């Protein structure tokens with residue numbers, strides 16, 4: 001891959017993300033700044049466990065269909081076979097939604113945007129899984145410390161999808177060829193404007209998988 005192809009690949013990844021960002025950063029920080037009142041937070045707490053999972057699953061499902069639209073717009077993804085297309089999405093689509101919900105978590109007050117205002121993990125007590133909500137708050141609190149830009153998570157969410165390990169993979173080599181073209185493209189745009197020590201950390205590994213636990217599996221039952 002030549003020099004100018006990497007620059008055209010980097011441009012296409014952020015081009016796909018800016019169209020599939022779903023909420024656009026600007027309004028997320030614009031409503032920092034609008035926090036649920038004490039009467040409003042109890043209204044969400046007062047909802048039944050079924051009522052709140054039915055809302056959260058609708059949020060989760062609608063956020064994944066943007067991730068697929070993100071995946072369908074990458075330069076190179078559609079060139080893989082559709083067997084590899086599903087199996088990369090099945091494994092990764094939920095993993096990037098957490099990485100995308102990094103946007104609209106506010107590390108100043110430890111709150112998260114949800115349906116118009118900013119809440120905090122006591123907003124989601126109706127799910128009955130405070131251990132899972134607390135630990136995704138910990139995940140987003142770690143991402144916010146790196147001060148991720150818009151084009152930076154565009155590349156990063158693409159590398160979470162394009163993983164050439166996984167289970168299945170008919171054209172395993174064709175995945176590695178696209179993965180290599182994106183991870184060098186990630187380090188190229190990174191070397192420009194000198195942000196080289198957000199790479200030395202970048203978790204270690206495995207915690208991104210650990211929070212896709214047995215609470216958010218199947219989950220068809222909800223309307």
Ligand SMILES: COc1nc2ccc([C@](O)(c3ccc(Cl)cc3)c3cncn3C)cc2c(Cl)c1Cc1ccc(-n2cccn2)cc1
Pocket residue numbers: 021022023056057059060063094097100101103104112113114115116124133136137211212213216
């Ligand atoms: C941290 O708790 C949450 N934070 C959220 C923050 C934002 C949004 C979001 O949908 C949104 C989604 C994507 C982008 Cl880019 C922007 C906004 C949204 C808010 N307002 C409008 N929208 C569209 C939903 C959240 C949800 Cl559902 C939860 C609960 C929850 C979290 C995780 C799991 N889970 C499942 C598997 C593992 N864990 C279950 C339930």
